[PDB]
Symmetry: C2
Subunit: 388 residues, 2 copies
Amino acid sequence: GLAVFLPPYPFRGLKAPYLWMFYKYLHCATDSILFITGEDYLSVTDDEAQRARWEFDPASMASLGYELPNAQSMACHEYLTLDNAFYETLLSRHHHDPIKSFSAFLTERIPDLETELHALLDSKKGIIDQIDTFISICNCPSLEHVARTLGKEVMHIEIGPLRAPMYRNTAYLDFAGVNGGTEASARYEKCQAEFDIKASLGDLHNYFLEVLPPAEAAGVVLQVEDDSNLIAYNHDFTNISLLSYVRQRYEKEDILVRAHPGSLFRLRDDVFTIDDSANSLAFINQCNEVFTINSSVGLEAILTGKKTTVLGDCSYAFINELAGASATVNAAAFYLFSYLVPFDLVFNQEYLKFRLGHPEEREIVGKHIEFYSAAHSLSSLINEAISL
Amino acid sequence: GLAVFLPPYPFRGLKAPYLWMFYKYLHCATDSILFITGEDYLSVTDDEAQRARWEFDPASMASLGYELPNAQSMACHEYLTLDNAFYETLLSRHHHDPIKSFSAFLTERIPDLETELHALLDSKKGIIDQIDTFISICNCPSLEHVARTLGKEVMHIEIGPLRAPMYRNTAYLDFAGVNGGTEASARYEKCQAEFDIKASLGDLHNYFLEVLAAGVVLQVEDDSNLIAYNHDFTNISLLSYVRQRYEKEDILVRAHPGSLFRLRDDVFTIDDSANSLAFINQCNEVFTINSSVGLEAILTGKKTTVLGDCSYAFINELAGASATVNAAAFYLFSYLVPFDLVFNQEYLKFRLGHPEEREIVGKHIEFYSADMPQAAHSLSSLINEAISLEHHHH
Ligand SMILES: [Cl-]
């Protein structure tokens, strides 16, 4: 059985922040799941005051592919609820800075949290013995240590870098960590010689493109300031120091900035030239090279053959650090077909069992292409796919 | 003789960043000054490409009270010029992170900089012998170490927390550090017994004044205050801090027009008051990292939370009306300096001899009153009389 970890701690000012994953696993569940979560996740569906949350938007339910759970759907699983008081305690140990508290939660072992997790799991020890793996939407060394004591692994699972409408929907699945401390590079290193791809980057990019590619400066990508990427996995770089970094190398009218609509702040009116392109691709094509901390837009540039500079930690960084025309295509082919997972599968318990048995990269790739579609060797599967 | 440290390194993307202090010292100088600075400081005045800078604006000139130097004014001093290329080197040592580089400069010793400082001072040993003190506009452990080694003291000088036209013009003068690592608290702890002020907090405020729910003050993102003296707090985490305690309905945000970024429209209630005071009176309590507005809030008797390091924080850490007043009185009259005086070589030589607090307060009140002497008044008596109400005669 699965144990899904969905912490209630409002680090970013939002209750039940990972509610969409709760709804998604509930909608896709076939067997009982152990949810390690908070009481807010259990009351929010019936909370008449949180009716305007984006998770309840019909467009979001359709985009992420779930429906709202009824009583039977929610009640037929197992629950362990994390104590509401631990958040305030964590805050007090970091000068009540919610951001710095979030960072510690993502990158450090927290004894109090491990203790509570142990106590919760011990209350249903018979249930825990049946657990096949732990699942987390974010890194959490506390949870990861606790899982090791039980001889269990933690699958880190998150929305992927390529998404609709532009691309096929993808997801992250990482045994080491998602976004930060990813295992993507280590995975490719072990199975590199199995990848001999007969294609260009355009061929790897168009297969995932679902829309007619746009027609044919220094690009700077801004991101949301208070997410895990810029709080913990940024190598101390920020939106400000990123702009400062590029400024050390370029003049103002040679710089095109791509703002993120979800950011708390935006650049003042007449400081930089702001891009107003219909999409990421239309922005990238106006640039000679692209600068980013760890935006997924950076992946898109690399896939289109644009010179990209990555200042933060991310899953696709190892691809860019390769000098070679064919060495890059092979690395990207692995990332796209073997590392990235079709979005729906990471919520499919049968697929998760498959990944849990530690299958060969060939089996993983074949399973993904099988999903994408409507040959035996790994390279032949990919080559045949991006030609048809 | 004075030595004034004006580094050329464009930590904030601005070359000759401390140009205004160069112009001010040149304007007020009576004797030869040793400027430890960069070539950019000497060429900017005659560089038409940079005439658009605020330092040349008539309003800014009259506000800070200086005029542009002619050939004689600039040439009659001693110069030691630092290599601009050290900035790029320092950058490379900090993962090309300009923020981390500036922070190191302000809070850490840098061996290469100490090497270059000593080598420059070695070129004019005879001149250095007659230097009494080093002056720095910012904290710099590299410079401070070099100076002490040569048996010189360091005065950290910067524009103050209270400024015209709202207030009397003030400046910082601190031997330990300016903004961060200040000696204001330690200094008061030593002389607090001499402060028995028989007046209100409002009297103190009104003396410096020349005009008359949850408040959050935003600051410039890349200045030294938010880079090094912030206790890891940012504009982002400051808003997070308050949101944890208050609903968005009860939050009022005072934006800083000098910032690189601005809040998106319909996220917070953005204040549009005419000034800081007008913003403060709309709040039950004010939250800040280390903005000068936080001082104004305390001076008006508003509850204030200070998350970062700054010179006035020790005032807030006291309980009691009498206690806060005696602390604020010290801060305003003894710690803060009349702006023009920190550029006056005689006053600086006066401070170098480390006089008693009464003498310092006496000097300051003399200036503020635009008088001249001395009297039998105690320190507190001077302050009490200076801020007390006196009726007109008839
Ligand atoms: Cl900030």
